[PDB]
Design a protein around this nucleic acid. Structure first.
Lengths: 349, 493, 475, 184, 502
RNA sequence: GAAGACAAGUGCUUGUCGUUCGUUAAUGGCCU
């Protein structure tokens, strides 16, 4: 049963994200609303429903801090200079990060952002950060509870997307890694634990008009960790395109040659890739296009075989704009443009 | 943290006769066009229902102007001799016209070719033909025959009632809103008659004396009528049977009057009156009929009327002169798939649980001087004060808020001779006012202890300094002689 | 509904509730008397809670299962202490408990007997001629647990010892939802999806009365000694009964009825209300899965009563640091003048070829284009004579129309200043006779005062000009 | 008939008798960052951080031990030097406040609850010189005071231990400096 | 630069200065981000959150030259909103009270101290409490008569405070100053803001009136005069901000102080009027018109005297009949209907002109009957029915020159239901007087028939009014306020705390 | 006014003083 049937939505669903420990879904789009749906098999009712005024909401993420496991902030932003941060009872606690402590001149908008953990390594204290995008190559890093501008990370070219590896070093210690993407297809590897230096560069084989990268097989921003020992290095890397091409990289072998051959070039879609998310176990690769209706395709891993039975023709999707997996139960939530978040269950899990 | 306060502009203690808020509404009427007619225009009345048209009498002609185009829509011309008054009914469909041959010829408006009903009234010339405000089928005309006849236009061949007793020349009658039976009828001898048409009617109930010949009579409230007669005009209270007010604030004899109520204005109820001087003054019954605003037209004004409250368009104040002129013044008044991908913008948070708005209101755009003082560019803020396209108020508000905030010298240390000449060319104008001369006294004296040494090298400043010597000594001579009266004035106190 | 299965402890201070959480049923206990983040997560996706029961020395609840075994949950730590495992694997449809003995229903119709003390299956046990069974409750004869009641659309009174069905009761068309022993004679049967409760008699084997709710009956509770029966209705309402066992007497309608309608106007569903003697407890779901409660005293309460709750349906957000608009609550508020009137204390109020008659004419009426035709005259012999043949009452009104033109036009007090003096010269004797000169000549006195205060400042500027001017001319 | 009393408090009692320290703030946020604790000149206030209001005041007029120390009228000399959050006595028992005075006195207080009118007082020995600053590491305590034999004040560094007895505190002389202008 | 503080990381540096701005230096790229204005200068910056969560900081409020006025401010690091600001109630005394030394800036002003001028002031400031007895340290305070908030005219502002909740509810600026437009820096610190000197309410409580004086900059041609600006303000009961309707530039002409103000009671014009007495002794009757939304002068009374009495006080008769006016050594009784002397056909020597022994400090009336007058030397009590004094009290030993003139008025108020309280102050010394004072509250009724109660406070007392809850309120040097007035249960306990490597 | 201390200049002179006794001007500016 649907995720929006108990309370429907108006604008095209833009971003979904489940809760890493709780049962929740966060639907929000251009409707200037946040809606939180508790999820069952039978009924999916509103927990609450926040309406911001004046800010379309293009990406939404829950964020449970790695230290406290009691903060549970909700970071949401759009095509504005600011970024609201709703905390988790009639009165809501909503902070807004209006100001960049260095410079507003690079980034004029916060329309794409990902929220990652980070370790200090002078102190063994873990806080979150907010990763942004910017003018031409700038990825800015705001401290997730203070709004302090930490570190600026430029790349050559034009950024289209980025994603965040995690490398565990020992027990209690790990370093996080940026993976920025030039539009032409050059992958940068910044590391955020020490101050931002390149680790390595490698061009994707081919890949001219590239939209999105997301890594997977371990802890990502969609299927994150709970304690520091849960943080695991990822294993699959997928690179979108504007011509359907997804390129899968085995992260064990591709970190050697620094111009690596991808494993299999997935080309089953016919349009611009817009959502690449993995299963939390790292066995399934969604790939979706916001251009043509009914365009979600699942890719099995490691066999790189697209599943053939689902989705059928009569599987109601719409123009898929926002895909999300559960962390725990194996559920699958797929947005649309109509507003209806239609929910599935991978019956293996 | 606090928001930045806007710099508050200097407001002097108020010189007398400020722009009162009723003088802001009645001065909106501009773009006065003057239409020549062939003879004196006698009565002007507006269509009540959709008020976009008003009839205007003339010599043998009733014209119909429009609201928005302000030109003649239709023209009634089938009359034999001069037609005096053209009212509309309260329905708005069907208008009257009383002639000099004594016939009132009532027919539908917007149709000048069908004289629907030609009431042969008295053989004396009928001046005033009006419709009843309450009952829409009873007409009442007057005549030069000194009898007013209430015509029921089911029967255009007999007057329903002959209403009489008048001594001399009834040339106005008007009905009263609370009573459909009661009729105010004004003779020319004085002596406003009040009739009950459900009675015998040949005698009045009670009369109202107007010591001079009363020319126009208009009911204003359900309890009050207004005698517009001779030099003054007087109001009257019916249940009191006694006058309440009198305003003899005119010069020559009145001609017309008009009352309108509950319209888009700071003044609720308006009472305008013609004075046969071109002089239409506007009065109000809420404020004890005090004078509020006045126009002056070229020749003497006979007929004047205003668009009603239900106008919902550009208003009109139409006044008609004796010399053939109408004078009108007015208060004027992508793709589909792209819109389906972004349709949330018009939602405005209706059925969600919590509404939260952080967005601060866009304030007024900060001026070029205020932007400089906020960013401490003081020497440039003073140079930004003397722009020719800038009000004389704001330049004073610079110099107070540059004197109050910093000292005046810091904006002045770097000034060369060429940057100094826009200052004094304002200061030569600045001391002549009383509103700035206590402040420009500071700004001149700080120059002279600063730049008197340069002033020997610059003969161009010296001519401004000799001109400043004269005008200040002139402003002595004002301030001396105006002091001389105040010491003199205390004898008479 | 989100709450699948809910049940109160005896004496009504807690309830367990069982809800789904991402295809894994969780159970959780809240308090009701005046949260609890702790929960028991069921590990498998497939095993589901089927019947639920408390225990009156840790406070434990008992979980009947889909699995074939009975979980036993202590509430203090989220741990399941021991498992009562039927060797066969069918779902357990009903669970029951009094004292050390436990009793449950296999979906293959098999009775079972467990000890809480001894932790042991007493008897695998089936009986004839009851082919489907889904609700079992034991009679409270005393310490003697014997002759227990089981039902599915028809009730059988069945002994333990002779292990046969003694009394056979007529029942419903639906399977029975609620089956509870009120008194040692009387007990309730209630069906699924029916508006009809029965009150039967154990010894007689008859129906005494029936009870009728206005919609379908979902959950049942009853007071101590058969005084009050509070029926949770599927529409969401508590149709209660007052003295149902006392003497049209065949069917008894509901005495008092309880709804909950929120403050915005929505109807809130009620599930599983508890009643004790003279104290009623409501529950409802405030958020999607959080239950809130309310104790209320119900014999005070009228026959129909809607508990009204403030829900933040359209509540605009009040940040405590934030003002009602825009700024902070600790920010200073600025001096904003705006539309102030600015007045001085000097501004008083509320305390022979001549041009005479034309000037006198434009003062009777107020006329401004006609005054300015007069004031172009500048010969002082005209200025002397025109004021002289003027009514003295008109001269006072003339001075007011002077100072208005003097104030609003600065250069104008050059030529007009002679035309103010002779007004004061000729009509000075009349001007003593008016009682309030300061009131009437206020605008005159205000304009002449503001010129008077510039006298020390302008004479100060004279010297500092003539410092320089006497200097730079010579050298 | 008539009575006099004291209703509203005054200053927030900043550390200006030091006038040497550039970190003058005495107030501390709690462990659970829900409430904020300021010693006024007349009382000690606990403001809730979310609801922005006072959730409890601790007047010195109520307790005899508080009024014997701070509400003394002949000497207004003693003042709150620094609040510490935890129990100095017992490891991690909650809702306790330990308060260090200007002259060697220690008061143990209770926010979030009714004030027990018998605090665990511990007058610090060797406080000839007046107490100026106290601070703590994890279970290790030091003391800064103002000592004097130029008109400048020399600072002496000490240390604290507990449970030799209850009232006793071993004071160790960690360091000393001869005269100080800005200790920070 | 007043205080610096690193974060817990060490990559950010807070600042603090006479400029009223917290600047957050990045040490990596040397940019900065800063809150512009924070209600006075900032003494000590402090970051408190272990994650870098809260900025907490101390404020001086340098507008007061007579008192350290500390506002503890705390912020969220994220939004930089003022969250849970805490501030004691802030009076303004007549002089620098007690040992308070203004913070250090670059150049010595009357708002700050230099380095070289630091110790030369502190040595001098002790002598003003040793050489002189002239020190008063008095505070003008007015009580809101419908909301019982306690407004303090902190200079060019009002701290709206209430003592029941013990909390500041507002801080409104009341003058076109230079206040939030700019933090004053070292040459600009000589420019002091305009000073609210009088602040009264009408008995309605819907109107608040404001008298202030704007000052010129020094070294200008017009640095000699002083604009006396009067302001008449409104608010509803619902709103806590005030709104201005009539600003008045220069009552009684230019450069004339209007130092004493009494509002009108409900009897005369529903308490919508105020009176202003000059140093010359002129009386104007400002009041509120109805058809206009604004104030005018209904009645004036302007004498021109050869001398200037800077000590005036006046009292109103509760019927609305007549106005008591006090000039130096001399009372006046004015018929309100004429603004002239009370001319009597009786000629029973009930003269409007009285002749007192010393300059009047207060004029107070208990009822229509009594009238209590404090001169510079003495206190007297004169009935209205017979014009003969009842009780004499020589306040000459307690008050010789202890007060600048006029400031006695704020100490002595009259509860209209019970009676009077005067407020007598001693300094006490052993063996040069000490810094410590001692104030005694004495209760009076029916033009000082009896002493109802002598209350001896151990510190100083600077102001008394009587709250309309039949009680007197007083300040103190330490800004304190005082009132002179008449199995399952064990299963419940364990679930209370429990719910809330390999 | 004095003492104290320090610096410069060539024992002396000038200068300063986070001291005491006594009298009443570092290119440095206000967020989003």
């Amino acid at each position: 049963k649907d995720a929006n049937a108990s309370h429907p939505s108006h604008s095209a669903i833009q971003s979904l994200s489940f809760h890493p420990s709780k049962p929740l879904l966060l639907t929000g789009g251009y409707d200037k609303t946040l809606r939180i749906y508790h999820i069952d098999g039978k009924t999916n009712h509103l927990v609450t429903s926040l309406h911001l005024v004046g800010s379309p909401i293009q990406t939404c993420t829950f964020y449970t801090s790695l230290s406290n496991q009691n903060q549970q902030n909700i970071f949401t932003a759009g095509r504005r200079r600011y970024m609201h941060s709703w905390d988790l009872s009639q009165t809501a606690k909503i902070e807004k990060f209006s100001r960049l402590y260095g410079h507003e001149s690079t980034q004029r908008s916060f329309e794409n952002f990902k929220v990652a953990h980070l370790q200090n390594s002078q102190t063994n204290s873990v806080h979150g950060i907010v990763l942004l995008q910017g003018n031409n190559g700038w990825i800015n890093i705001l401290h997730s509870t203070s709004g302090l501008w930490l570190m600026g990370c430029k790349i050559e070219g034009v950024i289209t997307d980025f994603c965040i590896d995690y490398q565990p070093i020992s027990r209690g210690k790990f370093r996080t890694i940026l993976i920025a993407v030039n539009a032409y297809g050059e992958v940068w590897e910044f590391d955020l634990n020490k101050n931002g230096h390149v680790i390595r560069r490698w061009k994707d084989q081919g890949g001219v008009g590239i939209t999105k990268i997301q890594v997977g097989g371990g802890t990502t921003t969609t299927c994150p960790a709970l304690q520091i020992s849960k943080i695991k290095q990822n294993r699959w890397l997928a690179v979108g395109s504007e011509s359907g091409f997804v390129n899968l990289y085995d992260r064990n072998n591709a970190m050697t040659s620094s111009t690596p051959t991808p494993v299999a070039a997935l080309d089953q879609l016919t349009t611009t890739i817009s959502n690449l998310q993995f299963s939390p176990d790292g066995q399934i690769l969604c790939m979706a296009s916001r251009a043509v209706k009914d365009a979600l395709r699942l890719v099995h891993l490691p066999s790189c075989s697209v599943f053939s039975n689902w989705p059928t023709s009569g599987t109601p999707l719409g123009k898929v704009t926002s895909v999300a997996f559960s962390p725990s139960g194996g559920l699958l939530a797929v947005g649309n443009e109509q507003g209806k978040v239609r929910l599935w269950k991978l019956n293996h899990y | 943290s606090t928001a930045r306060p806007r710099i508050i502009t200097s407001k002097a203690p108020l010189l007398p006769q400020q722009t009162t808020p009723e003088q802001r509404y009645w001065r909106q009427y501009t773009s006065a066009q003057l239409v020549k007619e062939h003879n004196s225009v006698t009565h002007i009345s507006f269509n009540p229902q959709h008020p976009h048209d008003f009839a205007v009498t003339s010599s043998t002609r009733v014209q119909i102007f429009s609201s928005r185009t302000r030109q003649v829509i239709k023209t009634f011309s089938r009359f034999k001799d001069v037609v005096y008054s053209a009212s509309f009914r309260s329905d708005g469909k069907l208008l009257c016209a009383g002639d000099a041959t004594g016939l009132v010829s009532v027919y539908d408006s917007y149709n000048p070719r069908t004289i629907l009903l030609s009431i042969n009234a008295s053989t004396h010339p009928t001046h005033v033909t009006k419709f009843h405000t309450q009952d829409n089928k009873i007409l009442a005309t007057a005549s030069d025959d000194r009898v007013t006849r209430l015509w029921d236009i089911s029967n255009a061949y007999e007057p329903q009632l002959e209403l009489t007793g008048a001594t001399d020349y009834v040339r106005t009658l008007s009905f009263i809103p609370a009573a459909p039976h009661l009729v105010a009828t004004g003779s020319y001898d004085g002596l406003i008659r009040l009739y009950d048409t459900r009675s015998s009617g040949s005698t009045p109930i009670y009369s109202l004396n107007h010591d001079q010949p009363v020319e126009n009579v208009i009911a204003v409230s359900p309890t009050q009528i207004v005698s517009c007669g001779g030099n003054n005009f007087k109001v009257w209270d019916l249940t009191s049977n006694k006058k309440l007010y009198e305003r003899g604030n005119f010069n020559k004899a009145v001609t017309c009057l008009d009352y309108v109520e509950n319209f888009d204005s700071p003044m609720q109820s308006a009472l305008i009156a013609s004075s046969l001087d071109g002089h239409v003054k506007v009065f109000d019954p809420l404020d004890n009929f005090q004078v509020k605003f006045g126009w002056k037209f070229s020749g003497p004004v006979l007929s004047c009327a205003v668009s009603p409250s239900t106008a919902q368009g550009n208003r009109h104040l139409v006044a008609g002169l004796s010399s053939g002129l109408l004078a009108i013044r007015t208060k004027k008044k992508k793709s589909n798939n792209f819109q389906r991908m972004m349709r949330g913008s018009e939602y405005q948070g209706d059925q969600e649980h919590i509404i939260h708005n952080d967005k601060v209101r866009s304030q007024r755009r900060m001026r070029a001087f205020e932007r400089n003082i906020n960013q401490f560019k003081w020497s440039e803020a003073l140079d930004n004060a003397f722009v020719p396209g800038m009000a004389k108020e704001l330049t004073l508000t610079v110099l107070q808020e540059l004197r109050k905030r910093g000292k005046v010298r810091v904006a002045l240390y770097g000034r060369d001779e060429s940057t100094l000449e826009p200052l004094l060319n304002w200061c030569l104008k600045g001391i002549e006012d009383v509103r700035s001369a206590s402040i420009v006294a500071d700004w001149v004296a700080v120059v002279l202890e600063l730049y008197g040494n340069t002033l020997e090298s610059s003969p161009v400043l010296q001519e401004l300094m000799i001109d400043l010597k004269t005008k200040v000594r002139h402003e002595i001579h004002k301030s001396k002689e105006a002091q001389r009266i105040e010491g003199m004035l205390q004898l008479l106190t | 509904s989100p709450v699948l299965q809910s049940a109160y402890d005896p004496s009504g201070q807690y309830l367990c509730y069982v809800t789904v959480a991402l295809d894994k049923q969780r159970v959780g206990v809240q308090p009701t008397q005046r949260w609890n983040e702790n929960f028991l997560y069921l590990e498998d996706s497939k095993l589901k809670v089927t019947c639920l029961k408390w225990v009156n020395d840790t406070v434990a609840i008992i979980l009947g299962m889909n699995n074939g075994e009975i979980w036993l949950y202590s509430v203090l730590a989220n741990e399941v202490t021991y498992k009562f495992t039927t060797g066969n694997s069918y779902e357990i449809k009903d669970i029951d408990l009094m004292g050390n003995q436990l009793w449950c229903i296999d979906s293959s119709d098999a009775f079972y007997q467990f000890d809480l003390l001894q932790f042991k299956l007493l008897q695998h046990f089936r009986i004839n001629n009851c082919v489907q069974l889904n609700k079992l409750t034991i009679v409270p004869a005393g310490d003697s647990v014997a002759q227990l009641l089981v039902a599915s659309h028809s009730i059988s009174l069945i002994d333990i010892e002779e292990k046969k069905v003694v009394m056979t009761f007529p029942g419903h068309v639906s399977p029975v939802s609620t089956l509870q022993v009120i008194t040692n004679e009387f007990f309730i049967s209630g069906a699924e999806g029916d508006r009809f409760l029965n009150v039967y008699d154990i010894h007689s084997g008859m129906t005494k009365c029936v009870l009728v709710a206005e919609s379908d009956i979902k959950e049942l509770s009853h007071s101590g000694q058969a005084d009050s029966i509070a029926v949770t209705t599927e529409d969401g309402s508590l149709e209660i009964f007052v003295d149902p066992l006392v003497s049209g007497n065949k069917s008894k309608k509901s005495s008092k009825k309880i709804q909950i309608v929120s403050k915005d106007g929505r109807k809130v569903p009620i599930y599983n209300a508890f009643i004790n003697k003279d104290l009623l407890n409501v529950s409802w779901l405030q958020n999607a899965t959080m239950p809130y409660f309310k104790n209320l005293q119900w014999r005070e309460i009228p026959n129909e009563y809607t508990v009204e709750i403030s829900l933040n349906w359209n509540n605009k957000n009040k940040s405590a640091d934030r003002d009602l608009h825009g700024k902070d609550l600790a920010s200073a508020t600025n001096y904003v003048e705006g539309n102030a009137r600015v007045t001085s204390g000097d501004n008083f109020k509320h305390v022979t070829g001549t041009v005479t008659v034309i000037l006198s004419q434009a003062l009777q009426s107020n006329d401004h284009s006609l005054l300015e035709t007069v004031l172009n005259n500048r010969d002082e012999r005209v200025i002397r004579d025109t004021i002289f043949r003027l009514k003295p009452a008109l001269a006072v009104i003339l001075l007011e129309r002077l100072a208005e033109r003097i104030a609003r036009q600065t250069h104008r007090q050059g030529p007009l200043n002679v035309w103010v003096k002779w007004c004061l010269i000729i009509h000075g004797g009349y001007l003593v006779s008016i009682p309030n000169l300061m009131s009437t000549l206020s605008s005159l006195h205000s304009t002449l005062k503001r010129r008077s205060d510039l006298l020390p400042r302008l004479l100060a500027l004279d010297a500092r000009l003539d410092c320089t001017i006497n200097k730079f001319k010579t050298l | 008939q008539y009575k006099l009393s004291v209703v509203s408090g005054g200053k927030p009692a900043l550390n200006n008798l030091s006038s040497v320290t550039g970190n003058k703030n005495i107030a501390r946020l709690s462990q659970d960052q829900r409430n904020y604790i300021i010693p006024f000149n007349n009382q000690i206030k606990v403001y809730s951080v979310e609801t922005r209001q006072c959730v409890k005041t601790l007047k010195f007029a109520n307790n005899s031990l508080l009024s014997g120390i701070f509400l003394q009228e002949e000497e207004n000399n003693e003042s709150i030097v620094k609040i510490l959050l935890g129990d100095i006595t017992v490891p991690q028992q909650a809702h306790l406040i330990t308060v260090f005075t200007n002259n060697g006195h220690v008061i143990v207080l209770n926010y979030k609850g009714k004030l027990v009118e018998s605090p665990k007082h511990f007058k610090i020995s060797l406080a000839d010189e007046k107490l100026a600053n106290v601070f703590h590491s994890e279970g290790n305590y030091r003391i800064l005071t103002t000592f004097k034999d130029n008109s400048l004040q020399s600072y002496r560094l000490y240390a604290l231990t507990f449970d030799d007895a209850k009232k006793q505190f071993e004071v160790a002389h960690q360091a000393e400096w001869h005269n100080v202008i800005l200790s920070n | 630069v007043l205080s610096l503080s690193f974060s817990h990381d060490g990559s950010y540096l807070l600042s603090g200065g006479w400029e009223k701005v917290m600047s957050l230096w990045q040490l990596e790229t040397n940019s900065q981000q800063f809150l512009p204005r924070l209600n006075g200068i900032i003494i000590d910056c402090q970051v408190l959150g272990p994650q870098g969560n809260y900025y907490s900081l101390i404020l001086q409020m340098t507008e007061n030259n007579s008192n350290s006025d500390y506002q503890f401010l705390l912020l969220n690091a994220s939004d930089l909103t003022s969250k849970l600001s805490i501030n004691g109630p802030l009076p303004v005394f007549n002089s620098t009270i007690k040992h308070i030394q203004q913070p250090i800036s670059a150049m010595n002003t009357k708002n700050s101290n230099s380095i070289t001028s630091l110790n030369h002031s502190k040595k001098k400031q002790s002598r003003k409490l040793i050489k002189s007895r002239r020190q008063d340290f008095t505070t003008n305070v007015e009580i809101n008569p419908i909301n019982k908030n306690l407004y303090f005219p902190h200079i060019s502002a009002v701290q709206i405070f209430d003592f029941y909740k013990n909390e500041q509810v507002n801080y409104q600026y009341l003058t076109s100053g230079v206040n939030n437009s700019m933090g004053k820096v070292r040459f600009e610190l000589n420019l002091q803001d305009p000073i609210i000197t009088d602040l009264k309410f009408t008995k309605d409580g819907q109107w608040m009136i404001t008298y202030e004086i704007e000052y010129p900059p020094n070294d200008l041609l017009s640095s000699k005069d002083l604009t006396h600006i009067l302001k008449f303000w409104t608010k509803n009961d619902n709103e806590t901000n005030w709104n201005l309707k009539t600003k008045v530039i220069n009552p009684h002409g230019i450069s004339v102080p209007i130092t004493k103000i009494l509002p009108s009671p409900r009897s005369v014009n529903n308490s919508q009027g105020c009176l202003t007495a000059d140093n010359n002794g002129g009386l104007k009757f400002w009041s509120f018109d109805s058809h206009e939304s604004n104030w005018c002068l209904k009645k004036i009374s302007l004498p021109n005297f050869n001398h200037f009495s800077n000590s005036v006080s006046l009292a109103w008769s509760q019927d609305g009949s007549l106005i008591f006016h006090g000039f130096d050594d001399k009372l006046q009784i004015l018929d309100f209907d004429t603004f002239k002397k009370f001319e009597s056909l009786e000629n029973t020597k009930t003269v409007s002109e009285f002749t007192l022994d010393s300059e009047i400090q207060t004029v107070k009336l208990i009822n229509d009957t009594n009238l209590i007058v404090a001169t510079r030397t003495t206190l007297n009590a004169i009935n209205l029915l017979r014009g003969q004094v009842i009780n004499s009290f020589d306040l000459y030993p307690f008050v010789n020159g202890v007060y600048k003139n006029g400031h006695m008025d704020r100490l002595i108020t009259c509860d209209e239901r019970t009676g009077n309280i005067a407020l007598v102050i001693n300094q006490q010394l052993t063996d040069v007087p000490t810094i410590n004072y001692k104030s005694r509250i004495i209760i009076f009724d029916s033009d000082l028939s009896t002493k109802l109660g002598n209350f001896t406070h151990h510190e100083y007392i600077s102001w008394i009014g009587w709250n309309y809850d039949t009680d007197f309120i007083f300040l103190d040097i330490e800004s304190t306020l005082g009132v002179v007035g008449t199995x399952x249960x064990x299963x419940x306990x364990x679930x209370x705390x429990x719910x809330x490597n390999d």
